[PDB]
Structure 1
Amino acid sequence: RDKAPVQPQQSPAAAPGGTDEKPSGKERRDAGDKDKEQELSEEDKQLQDELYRPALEELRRQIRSSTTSMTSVPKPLKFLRPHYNKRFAADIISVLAMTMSGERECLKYRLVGAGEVAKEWQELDDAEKVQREPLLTLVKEIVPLLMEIEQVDMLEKDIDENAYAKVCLYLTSCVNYVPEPENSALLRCALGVFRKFSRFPEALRLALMLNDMELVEDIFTSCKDVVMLGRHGVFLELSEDVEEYEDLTEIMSNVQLNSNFLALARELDIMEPKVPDDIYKTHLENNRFGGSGSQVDSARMNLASSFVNGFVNQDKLLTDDGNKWLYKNKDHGMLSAAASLGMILLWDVDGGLTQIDKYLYSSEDYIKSGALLACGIVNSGVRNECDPALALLSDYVLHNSNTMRLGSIFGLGLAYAGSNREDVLTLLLPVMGDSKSSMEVAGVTALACGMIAVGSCNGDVTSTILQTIMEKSETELKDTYARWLPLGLGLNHLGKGEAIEAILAALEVVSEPFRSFANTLVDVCAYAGSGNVLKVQQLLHICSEHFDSKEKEEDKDKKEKKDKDKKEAPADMGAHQGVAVLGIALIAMGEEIGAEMALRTFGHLLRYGEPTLRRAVPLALALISVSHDADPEVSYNSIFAARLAAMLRQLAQYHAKKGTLTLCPYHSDRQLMSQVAVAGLLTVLVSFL
């Protein structure tokens, strides 16, 4: 109707006209009024007036909430103590209490730091449990633990909307936009409601982000309570890091309850179903052995081809293909070929000893040292290959068993990940105290103790890596030491959630840009990735640093950091000119499934002229795809047809055919512009089943 009968009712100040007009306005409050509430300029004078004055607070929050305010709007509701499935309930509850209580939670969440906003917050939580459309109420009620009692208060009936919808969008947006400390509340209260619930790989991805040891005991009494079985042994062992299968095999070495979790969840039963079934359902032919194994000769390309043939795995045929192929081979390639029988067969525990045993203790140092390297390759649960190598290791400067130290300290780094294995590190004290002029002694020292030490409890600054810091800064020689020791330093820094070890090594370490490059290595490895863009604008500024190798690793951190929100991962690094930066993006594509935009970047990155960068393209190019596939390969044949390029092409052919185990060895590969002695360890980036 017209506002002529109802409009001058705001003019009197008598109590009965208010106490019946406000219930009369409550009936018309289903649409608020006729219109956009142009009573405001006349009824804002009624502020100073004071029985049913909380109903006057309802009118006042109704009209101030009706037009616009950020702090004075929820003040009549916090003064009101709301009192006295509907359209009106959707109005004053849904949009008005959602937006109004939302700005009260934001304004007091940023302002003060009461219980009133907790009571209103639980009331709105209950009202949106009535409304039952989550998603927006949830993401609003994150920013007020509050979210803990919100989840256990909310979770009674609906499982997959809160679990799938809430835990999907808030897990992804929590690692994406939100900082870290509330993600622990996600993980613990999600451990509560998922502890109530079935389909346990939600809790196993909670074990992925948590890395908790109680969780695997609860999910093994519960996932033994739910008797597939060896398959969750498989992605259990794939999912788990270095620590919790050794803590798991020690507390389950105590209890075990059927001993089949000691069978599955240490080793050997992720791997017993696969390799026969790998032979069975797949049938791989011979003309890539012969054709791709025919790609000419030259003891390099041929040597690489042995590696390519070797990583073929239809039987361990290229293993037992005669003799005179390794006799053509030379020292560090003899390491690569002695380890290549390791690479053909990362299973066959009993067959590993009886195949490598001919090449064990042979006439050649590289055959025996790469042979124990192969013993470290083939398995990770044997630990009886240690002692024939372990006993020999000491040489005190540069004898044979230091190369067995390289293959056996590295291959034993492949072998075990304990709570903290300490006996092998007490063996590692005369290794770094030995300090051979061979790089990969301290190389596989840092990398191997890092593989022992990735997933440490927020890292540690213990005397192991503290000792290799002090003995690192002891000798400033052969800067590959100053690169690959901060490798294993940052590997021990992995396992962090909140580590101040960048500040600790910042105080101990920093100097002339060898150890400032150690500073940027700890800066890389301590910062795995979250919504933490301040180090990304730090990346923007110190990306322009005149020393152009802290540029290399510091800009190289990007594929670790933004690996999930990968749409921003295309950047203009190719549009820059510091050619190692084009190398950095060339790393940053990598190996996943590799969409058309990535191969489109390999359109330009495929065509470059420097042999380390033209060498650098087919590696990640054929890692990212594990004609179509062979079309860029024959395009590389069109590129060259140097020797490096030929080797790079061979590597690409090999490629053609946050788990830390796939995170380490390519950052171990990042110093490739060097000797084949370095490439003798190039075959230790064991990141594929």
Structure 2
Amino acid sequence: VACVPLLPPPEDVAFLKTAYSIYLSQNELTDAIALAVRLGEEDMIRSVFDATSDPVMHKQLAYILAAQKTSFEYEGVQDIIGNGKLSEHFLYLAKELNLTGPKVPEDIYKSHLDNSKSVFSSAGLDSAQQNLASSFVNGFLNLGYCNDKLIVDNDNWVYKTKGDGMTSAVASIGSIYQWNLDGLQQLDKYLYVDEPEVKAGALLGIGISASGVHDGEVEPALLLLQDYVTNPDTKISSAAILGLGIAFAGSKNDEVLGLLLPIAASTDLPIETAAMASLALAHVFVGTCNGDITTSIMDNFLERTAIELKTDWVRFLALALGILYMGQGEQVDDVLETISAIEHPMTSAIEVLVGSCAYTGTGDVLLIQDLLHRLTLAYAVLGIALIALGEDIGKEMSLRHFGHLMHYGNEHIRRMVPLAMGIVSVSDPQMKVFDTLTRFSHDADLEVSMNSIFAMGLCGAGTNNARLAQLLRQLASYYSREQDALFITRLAQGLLHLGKGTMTMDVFNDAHVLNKVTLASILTTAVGLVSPSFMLKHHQLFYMLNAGIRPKFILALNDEGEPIKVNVRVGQPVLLNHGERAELETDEYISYTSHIEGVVILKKNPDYREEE
């Protein structure tokens, strides 16, 4: 299984599907799920849960499946337990449904943080431009635990930024509320009344909050959003739409499709900078293809009318096809025929991206050659990152490929390459990649410098200030020539120490498979971050980076909440307990059958029973 996509041309998926049966024999369902995501076998995941009839095993599978998100948020994979707990035929459990519609994973994320701790922040400062940076960063630095009280408390801290900046500031309260069901309640009081920026921004704050606790909600954001859409607010609904798009990610339902779809056909792009909602549909129906979305995108692409000359939606509609087509490999070839047939200059860009996205984490000879043809534009090079990050050899292949962008001096060329470094190296920081990125900082183009610092924020992730402190001082010395730079640098810190510094964006998993969602998050934010980056847009798009977040953790359990020790050997705490953080290490004692990192049920021989 590791060898087939690693070493040869990797065309055939006969091997993968065959391995899946051998895995049933010996009762490694844990490897059977891992194959089952990637290929796009919704069917398998349910069928392996049905074979399971052991409660120990049942709850442990639910924990390691939660990590690959897309097949856990998705209905009837979580509700295999829900359909079959009602009348027994599978010995599905009540405590287990509280895992599958996520509550208890999120509860242990909190428990870990209260136990091994991390520092609080405040700091709103003053001036409008500084406030928005500081407000945004606050919410990122205290994400993943409710400490929003400080923000709420200073009404003037809230007040100071205006218009769409007020939408963000209010919404940041939502970032702090993220992953937590209780925190929806608290939000309501600000939502009702306020300034209109307060009103609107609450709805954006609800979409951020629900990202990772939507699956089994307690507040129905759809209902609030529905009401809003009938309300005037052409402009606001767009951001509203991005938030609910972020909210509805991983799952698929007709309900969300029904609310989104007519908004996409509004054509309120030219004046309000609205009608973004196809992006939002793309993000909901990730890894799957619904034809209504596809045709809509394609025909509006063909139009090129006076309304649709607005270049912002084109960047989003570009991205949209690839996110709807991430992970599905071969079947996408049907979509590609339709695409190749509709000739445009816009479309040639989109061909390489769909192919990149679809084959993601395993590159092929066809894909490398096809991207080199394009190059001799931004999307062809950004695609290299998506293929390269599953591949050992592909990481080395990156340095070769991005060589080309370095030998040209052209400014365009220079600017694109740092995002691509950012997308590959997100999982763990790569120092050789940082040596190249230093140079890109010190250029006579501002826009390259801006993307380099957004890139350093991406690459440093999963970790805090390593070499990065010394870089972070040099960045600071460029505030004095460039206004933009301060804002972007402020964002980098927020990302670097996101979710109290112990949470990550990564392609490593509690099952060691890439996460389709995480990849799309990073990709969509990379082009069009903030208003003077790329085409004129909104600062507001930055919250979309939230999708990316997975928390680091090994929690060993002997039962279901009783402690059992392991020691693991992180930074030098070194020789930490269970219930903490680790990366690239695994338990020193034996699982039911899994022997893998994440929330794990560990078992002992009864003769040398140990518990903490």
Please, what TM-score do these two structures have when normalized by structure 1? 0.66
- Give yes or no for the alignment of 1:533 onto 2:365: yes
Letter in 1 for 2:538: V
Q: What's 2:549 paired with?
A: 688
For 1:222-233, list aligned pairs within 5 A.
225=54, 227=56, 232-233=61-62
* 3-state SS of 1:424 partner: helix
Pick one of 662, 667, 677 that aligns with 2:523: 667
Pick one of 606, 609, 620 that aligns with 2:444: 609
Q: Which moved more, 1:471-480 or 1:366-375?
A: 471-480
Q: CA RMSD in A?
A: 2.7
- Give yes or no for the alignment of 1:643 onto 2:483: yes
Pick one of 412, 416, 426 that aligns with 1:580: 412
Pick one of 158, 169, 180 that aligns with 1:348: 180
Equivalent-residue separation in structure 1 for 2:167 and 2:118 (angstroms) = 30
Q: What's 2:297 paired with?
A: 468
Q: What's 1:652 paired with?
A: 492
Q: Residues 181-200 of structure 1, C-alpha deviation per residue, up to 9 Å, x if partnerless? A: 2xx22222221221122454
Equivalent-residue separation in structure 2 for 1:531 and 1:391 (angstroms) = 45
Q: Residues 125-182 of structure 1, C-alpha deviation per residue, up to 9 Å, x if partnerless? A: xxxxxxxxxxxxxxxxxxxxxxxxxxxxxxxxxxxxxxxxxx33x14xx24532232x
CA contact (8 A) 1:233 1:269 kept: no
Equivalent-residue separation in structure 1 for 2:316 and 2:452 (angstroms) = 22
CA contact (8 A) 1:479 1:514 kept: no
**Percent of aligned positions that are identical:** 27
Equivalent-residue separation in structure 1 for 2:59 and 2:35 (angstroms) = 20
- Give yes or no for the alignment of 1:442 onto 2:302: no
Q: Structure 1 residues 415 and 235, CA, compared in 2 at 3 Å: closer, same or farther?
A: farther
Q: What's 2:136 paired with?
A: 307
Letter in 2 for 1:389: L
Q: What's 2:336 paired with?
A: 502
For 1:43-54, list aligned pairs within 5 A.
none
Pick one of 160, 177, 198 that aligns with 1:367: 198
CA contact (8 A) 1:246 1:266 kept: no
Equivalent-residue separation in structure 2 for 1:518 and 1:541 (angstroms) = 14
Q: Return 5+ residue gaps in structure 1 as ranges.
A: 1-166, 545-550
Post-superposition shift, 1:586? Answer: 1.0
* 3-state SS of 2:477 partner: helix
Equivalent-residue separation in structure 2 for 1:204 and 1:492 (angstroms) = 22
- Give yes or no for the alignment of 1:630 onto 2:469: yes
- Give yes or no for the alignment of 1:386 onto 2:222: yes
Post-superposition shift, 1:277? Answer: 2.3
* 3-state SS of 2:517 partner: helix
Post-superposition shift, 1:614? Answer: 0.8
Post-superposition shift, 1:637? Answer: 1.6
For 1:318-329, list aligned pairs within 5 A.
318-329=150-161
Q: What's 2:284 paired with?
A: 452
Post-superposition shift, 1:599? Answer: 1.7
- Give yes or no for the alignment of 1:414 onto 2:238: no
Q: What's 2:596 paired with?
A: none
Q: What's 1:36 paired with?
A: none
CA contact (8 A) 1:496 1:526 kept: yes
Post-superposition shift, 1:515? Answer: 4.2
Post-superposition shift, 1:344? Answer: 0.9
Post-superposition shift, 1:612? Answer: 1.6
Equivalent-residue separation in structure 2 for 1:247 and 1:345 (angstroms) = 27
Letter in 1 for 2:477: S
Q: Structure 1 residues 254 and 394, CA, compared in 2 at 3 Å: closer, same or farther?
A: same
Letter in 2 for 1:574: M
* 3-state SS of 1:639 partner: coil
Q: Structure 1 residues 211 and 188, CA, compared in 2 at 3 Å: closer, same or farther?
A: same
Post-superposition shift, 1:553? Answer: 1.0
CA contact (8 A) 2:9 2:365 kept: no
Q: What's 1:135 paired with?
A: none
- Give yes or no for the alignment of 1:593 onto 2:419: no
Post-superposition shift, 1:323? Answer: 0.9
Q: Which moved more, 1:413-422 or 1:602-611?
A: 413-422
Q: What's 2:584 paired with?
A: none
- Give yes or no for the alignment of 1:376 onto 2:207: yes
Pick one of 675, 678, 685 that aligns with 2:538: 678
CA contact (8 A) 1:439 1:480 kept: no
CA contact (8 A) 1:308 1:654 kept: yes
Post-superposition shift, 1:419? Answer: 6.9
Post-superposition shift, 1:253? Answer: 2.8
Q: Which moved more, 1:467-476 or 1:606-615?
A: 467-476
Equivalent-residue separation in structure 1 for 2:30 and 2:455 (angstroms) = 30
Post-superposition shift, 1:427? Answer: 2.1
Equivalent-residue separation in structure 2 for 1:319 and 1:441 (angstroms) = 29
Q: Structure 1 residues 536 and 311, CA, compared in 2 at 3 Å: closer, same or farther?
A: same
- Give yes or no for the alignment of 1:489 onto 2:321: yes
Q: Structure 1 residues 592 and 347, CA, compared in 2 at 3 Å: closer, same or farther?
A: closer
Q: Return 5+ residue gaps in structure 2 as ranges.
A: 86-91, 498-513, 551-612
Q: What's 1:208 paired with?
A: 37
For 1:561-576, list aligned pairs within 5 A.
561-563=387-389, 564=391, 565-570=394-399, 571-572=402-403, 573-576=405-408
Q: What's 2:456 paired with?
A: 621
Post-superposition shift, 1:605? Answer: 2.3
Q: Structure 1 residues 588 and 407, CA, compared in 2 at 3 Å: closer, same or farther?
A: same
Letter in 2 for 1:424: V
For 1:278-293, list aligned pairs within 5 A.
278-286=113-121, 289-290=122-123
Q: Residues 525-547 of structure 1, C-alpha deviation per residue, up to 9 Å, x if partnerless? A: 44435342123122222211xxx
Higher relative contact order (CA 8 A, sep 6+): 2
Post-superposition shift, 1:633? Answer: 0.5
Letter in 2 for 1:604: R
Equivalent-residue separation in structure 1 for 2:148 and 2:258 (angstroms) = 37
Post-superposition shift, 1:318? Answer: 4.0
CA contact (8 A) 2:42 2:71 kept: no
Q: What's 1:73 paired with?
A: none
Please, what TM-score do these two structures have when normalized by structure 2? 0.74
Equivalent-residue separation in structure 1 for 2:241 and 2:309 (angstroms) = 22
Equivalent-residue separation in structure 2 for 1:320 and 1:619 (angstroms) = 28
Post-superposition shift, 1:506? Answer: 2.1
| Matched positions, count | 495
Equivalent-residue separation in structure 2 for 1:391 and 1:432 (angstroms) = 17
Equivalent-residue separation in structure 1 for 2:349 and 2:268 (angstroms) = 22
* 3-state SS of 1:284 partner: coil
Post-superposition shift, 1:412? Answer: 2.4
Equivalent-residue separation in structure 2 for 1:656 and 1:614 (angstroms) = 18
Q: Structure 1 residues 487 and 394, CA, compared in 2 at 3 Å: closer, same or farther?
A: farther
